[PDB]
Amino acid sequence: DMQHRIRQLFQASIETKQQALEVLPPYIEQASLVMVNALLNEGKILSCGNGGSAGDAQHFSSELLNRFERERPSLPAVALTTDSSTITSIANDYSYNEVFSKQIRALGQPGDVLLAISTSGNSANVIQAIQAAHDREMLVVALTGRDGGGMASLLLPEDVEIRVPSKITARIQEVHLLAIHCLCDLIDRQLFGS
Template identity: 60%
Template sequence: MDLISRIGQHFTDSAQTKLAAIEMLAAPIAQAAELMVACLVGNGKILACGNGGSAADAQHFAAELVGRFEMERQGLAAIALTTDSSIMTAVSNDYGYKLVFDKQVRALGQPGDVLLAISTSGNSENVVEAVHAAHDNDLRVVALTGKGGGEIGELLLDTDIHICVPSDRTARIQEVHALTVHCLCDGIDCLLLGVEE
């Protein structure tokens, strides 16, 4: 396959994965946006975590809330747990990377807050521990996963929301996660600002 055809196949595969996910994911994404708005209106905050590309998604989400997405509004309380290098290296050094998000959720999370836990496999050990910490501290969890949801999918409570991309391919899952982040940001803005269309 020549490079142009290969690139075209990536576009096609990405579009097909997204189209196949609409029916399955639209409702839980809407529920997650509603949950996050309830959290923010109640003076809560959203903590977000993930590794690698999922860390980038966590940071992207927090940036859009603290700054803005597409509409002007007051900044919203969101923290990416992937960004403080002193915390990340101290916890990793003293306790191991497994607890790098757990420690932050336990220190920063309050009842009524929301944890956005992102893992393409659903098996990232430090994200799994963050979910345990969230449950211990009465945070609700919105999980973005793929590949069937993995261990995180099994840990979620009835009060949590699971957005599991119907794909086993990491790149395709990450692409749907990026779109999901935009859908969440748009949904939050529309609900907060009373946008009808």
């Protein structure tokens, strides 16, 4: 029974990826171009998310700040989910909704990029992070799922949404991780060739 349940999970994950391969590629490519153009212009990338998505935020920032595959220079990315003093104080002093937006308002420079990760598209703090990136004239790459939630209504024409065609948070995170490896691979290829 457990073996069957595991297979069923592997299979659902495989199917979700096959469904995502049918619609995500163009958005994944557009998002990598948005990020490469920012990196080429002294810009940096900020990432935020909650739970497994906070793990994706820092997964992305480490691939860039250290490396993805080939040896190359560190690239500028900052995860907004890791400084516990900043996060706890903001949430404590005002509200949890401001933990990312408040850092973006300080760190965001025009032309920088915000990688906003949410499987529901409905996390208040990421919705507010997107508003704050817009206030700093930043472009937004949003990794989402379901119907895109409030995050999708905030996206502007230059922003890019990568909406996983799934309603299951765990499946969604699995594609998000793959999507991030694609972005890291495409950024390296674009900046340093194949």
